[PDB]
Design a protein around this ligand. Structure first.
Ligand SMILES: CC(=O)c1sc(CCOP(=O)(O)OP(=O)(O)O)c(C)[n+]1Cc1cnc(C)nc1N
Ligand SMILES: CC(=O)c1sc(CCOP(=O)(O)OP(=O)(O)O)c(C)[n+]1Cc1cnc(C)nc1N
Ligand SMILES: [Mg+2]
Ligand SMILES: [Mg+2]
Ligand code: NA
Lengths: 802, 802
């Protein structure tokens, strides 16, 4: 247990804590300005001149003094209540507030021993901010205390709420930009309080950093009427409190006492909510939220060159852009830095005085040191059930190509038992698609958690105020909740219709970048569980829907995060249920990855045994010798290669037909796509030798690919024999139609694959046969048109091994 | 002018209109069920049997009878008030409500003459829904009345609001799913009413289709308390009205009279708002919104097999899935269809009776016929200013590589004059980045439109209640507003930081698919203006930000919409301002496209004259002979090829160095990326002959690419000489650092490009030189570290022609 969760003070905040909070705010403002502006002389020792100012002034002043003020008060809170706390910095461009926090709390020097607590350390701390060889502009993963960089705005609330799930002792003050609040993802993030339980989960305190402005405009929320603003948050299930400061001549000490008293009223209400939830965990309470209204750039010069700067969008970037070049800007900078009175905050040796930090939390309650903000320190391996009990044994008993299994159902049973064995640290998310993607065997041991109104057992099924499945019709919520759940040391999976995974492409990009920086240069940030995404209900079999639901292209986005041997991205095609089981065990064991797991949910053949899936998954691509009819590679007339359940089914039917014509070929299945890249681009890929063995040194290769052919073509560009690959992929053809028609219009159906194989072998010799196959595809189509179902010869085909 | 906008009735709705609305609702429910279930015998003539039921039952019943009820009332409204109206179907899976609407209003037969108004037409109309060779499941662009397919949920409100911008006579009832309302984009879409003006823009009426459920869960908005629901919409600036029907035994006629009276109160308030705005266009009014609460699946059987179906998520997909296979499901279907009493709705010849449609609007006020729902019918070409006045003439007067121009500034001046010449039909959108991406010359002739509180001229600049620039910190809003603005026949552009364009990848996918279907098979849907997206503040020069802001990968997404010779997607790299001007003229003239226009905003050299940009843009890729030093292709030791402003600058510096070493090469610039693909994949690309002429038959090609190298490698896979291309792209390296460091860490800087060129020519011979260049890159880096700015030799370099 960290600290003493949810305890009220029952006395006023002491005047000593108020004095320490004002010193914190002044020292973090001073050091934030130092980080932005100063390359040397951090204490302004004589002579302090323009030569000490950075040659390239980059940064974001405006948000920062508001964050520094909140962080003083959140530190004071944590210390007085001993409260287990992780904050979210929505405006992650306020990086200096986050580095200054860690430097003040001591974690920065503990993690970065060269940045010492004295004048030499402080000089280095100032220069290194946003500087070549130094540290990023934003609250990056290399900053102690960060689980959210806040570079691409909008995910503050999904991350805050995902962090408190199954984390009942954890308090998350979530600082949200008022511009950020204009984004789609942030706007829906407010509603997460209908999806957490106040007994079994922790508590988020949203703090709207209502500083009036974004970069070059006011914000929507700052300029609507106060009555609209309050109705808005009340309508979303909060009790809104509002603090206003900095717009008049109120002295800073008074402002701190008034905020502290407010923040104690807010926390007391949170503690009341927490105590009440021990007895009534079914009534959803109105959680406090804080509207925090202060001037953007607070404490910087009010006017610069006749332009209003404090209390304006003009405070957003770097005030005094000429500070190095003109004595006029330099004099203003010097007076600004002096207004914090650093001679009271730093000892002569340049260490921050003890009376600045006596009010601060200590040990693991510190914001930089809490293990929830470095969740791999808390993470434990899942207690996984034995895989073999889930195997589809139909392949062993009856043959390769057996049955009509809906593949994700085996993964559902496996997830069900993972939740059973790990009852509060593995969650499932779905955007109203858990049952649709066939993972609902999980409801046998848990419920979808819903903390909002109930009506009737006639309609509410598998739903309770507490449970380990979460659904909301928002891919952004599912992805954001899951990410923070991983970042605080837990585990899980979500599922999406494949075309809609694109809604969160940009979130996958940011989490891949978090992983990239981490695996490369932050070894103190320990490994977290991987994002596991079941990409299902795919392009080939969106039977109730149509062309809007046909876009397998997240493959292509993911290929853009496969560099430097980071190995943070995996693209897997689950050929069948036994392959899916093998991939899933692997993904549930992995760490520091995004794993995109493609599987169809339609009734489909099972191709491999579980033991075979395990070996094949390891290699990445494998010959299926029981399906090949060639003796060796020299005999092979064409390589039949596929990735995806549907391309594989169609290739296999083509192979059966090609066999019967006396054509010689081998069958290669591809599961782990990026293992096709060269060793030069991927040091864990197939060697050229293994690749050549699979795909031959010079026979034609027909490659039936689940997604866009572009992907495979770009990936094998420097491989031996790549000029002989013919890649067939999805090509933006399709509608609401039968399963044969969908493969037909993309040249993916078995008859077109048989034709393409013939064309690659001898176009002249097989001209007639190619024609007959093309004519058969027309006939099968006319049959679907006239009759309303696909031709039996198509649908009724079973691989001859069965 | 269409109809008589914003007129009140001043009498009750007649009892004849109520009777016609009930017949409409019954006939559209009946035909929607017919579309889903029936392959033949649409009037249930003797014998009506299971053999008439579709073999594959696919569709979405639950939303549909709610949409049919609203559409009866919206038709009645349009007719009585003669109101210019386009509706949005958020739940686009309710396609049968939209096809039934068009069939009832007459447009379906006018556009589709084979689907006639009689028993044979009706049989064909039923069978073709969601059927091979037939029509889509959703409200697709081939349906008269659609500007929004609603397949990927969330964009209903940005589309509704973009449609009414500069459209003051237009009324848009926007039907929003209550599951859809859980998405990010929909949640922020509510706030658009702070960004429209009630005098100069039209009016959106959001109608929340609060049917209690999404696919397999209740919805958040249906289960919060009524007081939260109302506070929520009031807090977002609406006057909420709520209608509740269908949960008790109230007869249908009474329900219609009560709704009609409500809908007239709502419309009267909209007409009052419209009249008031003629005098006070500065006070933002509280626009009505309608909470419409009815049972999902309304009018279907209450229980099926002991399970509650009407008023449940179980109504979502296809009730009675066994209707063809069991007499039990068939009998239930038969009684359901009979409950609408079709013998009262259809004449003996199977035409819909005149008394079903006497209340309907006629002519161009019909929902299927309004030209705002087919905006290419209204669209006019922009009055474009002459391009030559914007040219950067520094290249002509001083030489290739001249100056420090911020390229988007020339596009800003051009946009300024486009707005001047087309003052109410060209808009700019930006996610708080218009000034940051340098398009702010537009503010010289217009303002950012902001209909929310003002404070002071000290902070509000270039902002007014009416204007043709719109900003909100939401890429989803900018993209959605713009799309509907184009779809209703107008024009514009938006700009985004390049890495954040990914936020709307999935919207680009849906609009590309809309374009695909349209160019292929909907010739009555006339061409609309193109989406023009200035992709700027790119990966190489995000000076105040860092790694989160480095992702040029929307190139890769866009490559996935380049099929079938649809030609709906363009990727352009603006080499400099004169190239940007030429690309922009082209894009502003184009139709039916998404145009992604890459340009850097940093101070940068201008390479080509405007006349040269015009010729080069047409070819797609061009040799720069004034920069090449080889005589002919046989002399060429390496092809220096680049795409993007920064890769080009670095390649050009490498060329200057390579020249001075006596290396022979040619320089090729690439602007129109997809023109690199083969003719087989792109019938407007460079021929093999032109390609070979640019890139040689067999010399090595060094290709410096702005984005991920994967893209170029996949694109040129079947081109002559592609095995000799070495593609250098962004490789997920970078942080907050100097401009040299950013190109350095991706091997993109001039010294690494010079080295790579040497390595391709003779690795052994140039081993030492390659070493010295590698060592110089280390030195330049150490210099940035020690000094705080890049080495003068790097920054001060100007191409020798200047
Ligand atoms: C850094 C950057 O690229 C910023 S900071 C900023 C203004 C944020 O204002 P907010 O009110 O939220 O925060 P404040 O500084 O505390 O006032 C924008 C638009 N941007 C560009 C941007 C655009 N779009 C998205 C999704 N994310 C970002 N980061
Ligand atoms: C069709 C499809 O793929 C549907 S329909 C649906 C439920 C919508 O419920 P809503 O309450 O909005 O509408 P209703 O039918 O009127 O009750 C979902 C989750 N989906 C999958 C889905 C997921 N995510 C997104 C962005 N879009 C869609 N279409
Ligand atoms: Mg702000
Ligand atoms: Mg609904
Ligand atoms: Na090749």
């Amino acid at each position: 247990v960290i600290g003493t969760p949810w305890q009220k003070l029952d006395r006023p905040v002491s005047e000593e804590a108020i004095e320490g909070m004002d010193k914190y705010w002044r020292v973090t403002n001073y050091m934030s300005i130092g980080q932005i502006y100063l390359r040397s002389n951090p204490l302004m020792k004589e002579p302090f001149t323009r030569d000490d100012v950075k040659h390239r002034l980059v940064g974001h002043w405006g948000t920062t003094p508001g964050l520094n003020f909140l962080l003083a008060h959140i530190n004071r809170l944590i210390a007085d209540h001993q409260q287990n706390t992780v904050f979210i910095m929505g405006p992650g461009h306020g990086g200096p507030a986050g580095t200054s926090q860690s430097y003040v709390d001591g974690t920065y020097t503990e993690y970065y021993p060269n940045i010492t607590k004295d004048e030499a350390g402080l000089q280095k701390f100032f220069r290194q901010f946003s500087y070549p060889g130094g540290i990023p502009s934003h609250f990056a993963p290399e900053t102690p205390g960060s689980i959210h960089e806040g570079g691409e705005l909008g995910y503050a609330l999904s991350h805050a709420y995902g962090a408190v799930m199954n984390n009942p002792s954890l308090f998350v003050p979530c600082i949200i930009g008022d511009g950020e609040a204009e984004t789609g993802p942030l706007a829906t993030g407010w509603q997460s309080n209908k999806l957490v339980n106040p007994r079994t989960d922790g508590i988020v305190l949203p703090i709207l950093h209502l500083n009036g402005y974004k970069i070059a405009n006011p914000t929507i929320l700052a300029r609507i009427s106060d009555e609209e603003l309050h109705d808005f948050f009340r309508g979303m299930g909060y009790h809104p409190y509002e603090f206003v400061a900095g717009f008049d001549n109120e002295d800073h000490m008074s402002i701190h006492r008034r905020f502290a008293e407010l923040f104690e009223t807010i926390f007391d209400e949170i503690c009341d909510i927490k105590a009440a939830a021990q007895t009534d965990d079914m009534t959803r309470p109105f959680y406090p939220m804080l509207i925090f209204r202060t001037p953007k750039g607070w404490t910087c010069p009010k006017f610069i060159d006749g332009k209003k700067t404090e209390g304006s969008w003009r405070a957003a970037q770097v005030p005094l852009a000429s500070a190095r070049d003109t004595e006029e800007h330099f004099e203003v900078l010097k007076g600004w830095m002096e207004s914090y009175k650093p001679e009271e905050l730093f000892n002569a040796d340049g260490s921050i005085k003890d009376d600045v930090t006596a009010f601060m939390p200590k040990g693991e309650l510190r914001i930089g040191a809490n293990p929830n903000a470095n969740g791999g320190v808390i993470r434990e391996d899942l207690k996984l059930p034995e895989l073999d009990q889930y195997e589809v044994t139909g392949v062993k008993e009856y043959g390769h190509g057996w049955g009509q299994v809906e593949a994700p159902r085996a993964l559902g049973a496996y997830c069900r038992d993972i939740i059973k064995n790990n009852p509060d640290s593995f969650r499932i998310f779905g955007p109203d698609e858990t049952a649709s993607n066939r993972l609902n065997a999980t409801y046998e041991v848990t419920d979808k958690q819903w903390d909002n109104g109930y009506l009737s057992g006639l309609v509410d099924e598998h739903m309770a105020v507490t449970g380990q499945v979460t659904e909301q019709l928002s891919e952004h919520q599912c992805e954001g909740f899951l990410e923070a759940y991983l970042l605080t040391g837990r585990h899980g999976i979500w599922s999406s219709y494949e075309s809609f995974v694109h809604v969160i492409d940009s979130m996958l990009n940011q989490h891949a970048k978090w992983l990239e920086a981490t695996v490369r240069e932050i070894p103190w940030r320990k490994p977290i569980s991987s994002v596991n995404l079941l990409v299902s209900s795919h392009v080939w079999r969106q039977d109730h829907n149509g062309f809007s639901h046909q876009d397998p292209g997240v493959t292509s986005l993911l290929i853009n995060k496969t560099f430097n041997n980071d190995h943070v991205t995996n693209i897997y095609f689950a050929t069948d249920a036994n392959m899916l089981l093998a991939i899933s065990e692997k993904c549930f064991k992995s760490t520091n990855k995004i794993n995109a797991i493609f599987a169809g949910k339609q009734p489909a053949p099972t191709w491999v045994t579980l033991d075979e899936a395990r070996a094949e998954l390891e290699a990445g691509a494998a010959e299926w010798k029981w399906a090949s009819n060639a003796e060796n590679n020299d005999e092979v007339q064409v390589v039949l290669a596929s990735a995806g359940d549907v391309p594989t089914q169609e290739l296999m039917a083509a192979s059966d037909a090609l066999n019967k014509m006396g054509i010689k070929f081998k069958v290669v299945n591809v599961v782990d796509l990026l293992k096709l890249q060269s060793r030069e681009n991927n040091d864990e890929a197939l060697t050229d030798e293994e690749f050549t063995e699979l795909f031959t040194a010079d026979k034609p290769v027909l490659f039936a690919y689940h997604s866009y052919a572009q992907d495979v073509r770009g990936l094998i560009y420097d491989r031996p024999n790549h000029d002989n690959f013919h890649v067939v992929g999805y090509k933006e053809q399709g509608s609401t139609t039968t399963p044969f028609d969908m493969v037909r219009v993309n040249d993916m159906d078995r008859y077109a694959l048989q034709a393409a194989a013939l064309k690659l072998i001898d176009a002249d010799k097989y001209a007639d046969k190619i024609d007959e196959l093309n004519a058969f595809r027309k006939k099968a189509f006319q049959f679907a048109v006239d009759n309303g179902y696909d031709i039996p010869e198509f649908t009724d085909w079973v691989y001859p091994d069965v």
